[PDB]
Design a binder for this molecule. Structure first.
Ligand SMILES: Nc1nc2c(ncn2[C@@H]2O[C@H](COP(=O)(O)OP(=O)(O)NP(=O)(O)O)[C@@H](O)[C@H]2O)c(=O)[nH]1
Ligand SMILES: [Mg+2]
Length: 166
């Protein structure tokens, strides 16, 4: 079966681990905080094609490890995650995407922009239009708002990322 090596990146606390675990294992981590940059496997079918996904849950950017450039070079597709409740985490993604393109030495890189914590509408600071505008600036329309807690668009992040790799 075709295998897809995916990498989840973003600033600290945005829900990288929560999204990965919700997708792969169907459970919400609550306050449990993985401290390993681990990989998580799940088989799916996207557009009538079977896919084995292996998803790497990276450390928050503030706390990035010596392995990060390896991940950026070798990953086949990237989910760049922010929280809709923290503008800093959103703006941080511009530099982060630039780093990936620098490492890859091309702009042709499968990527999805993910505004997580969409269940926290009362605490929103990043507008949905802001996310759409960033995706447009990147010339890549793949953009979702998600909630690892409520299971909104969680599977779709990974399906849509697969669609770009295909
Ligand atoms: N309300 C809400 N909370 C969330 C969501 N995702 C994660 N969280 C919460 O935000 C906190 C951090 O989540 P976590 O998945 O560990 O984030 P992370 O990006 O992996 N952090 P780190 O960069 O340190 O590894 C946790 O308290 C978690 O329960 C979400 O979609 N909605
Ligand atoms: Mg984490």
């Amino acid at each position: 079966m075709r295998e897809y090596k995916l990498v989840v990146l973003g600033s600290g606390g945005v829900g990288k681990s929560a999204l990965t675990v919700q997708f792969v294992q169907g459970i919400f981590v609550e306050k449990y905080d993985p401290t390993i940059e681990d990989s998580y496997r799940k088989q799916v079918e996207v557009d009538a094609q079977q896919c084995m996904l292996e998803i790497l849950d990276t450390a928050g950017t503030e706390q990035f490890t010596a392995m990060r450039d390896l991940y950026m070079k070798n990953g086949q597709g990237f989910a760049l995650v922010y929280s809709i409740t923290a503008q800093s985490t959103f703006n941080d993604l511009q530099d982060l995407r630039e780093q990936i393109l620098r490492v890859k030495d091309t702009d042709d890189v499968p990527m999805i922009l993910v505004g997580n914590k969409c269940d926290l509408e009362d605490e929103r600071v990043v507008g949905k239009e802001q996310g759409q505008n960033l995706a447009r600036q990147w010339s890549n329309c793949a953009f979702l708002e998600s909630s690892a807690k409520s299971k909104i668009n969680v599977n779709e992040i990974f399906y849509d990322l697969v669609r770009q790799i295909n």
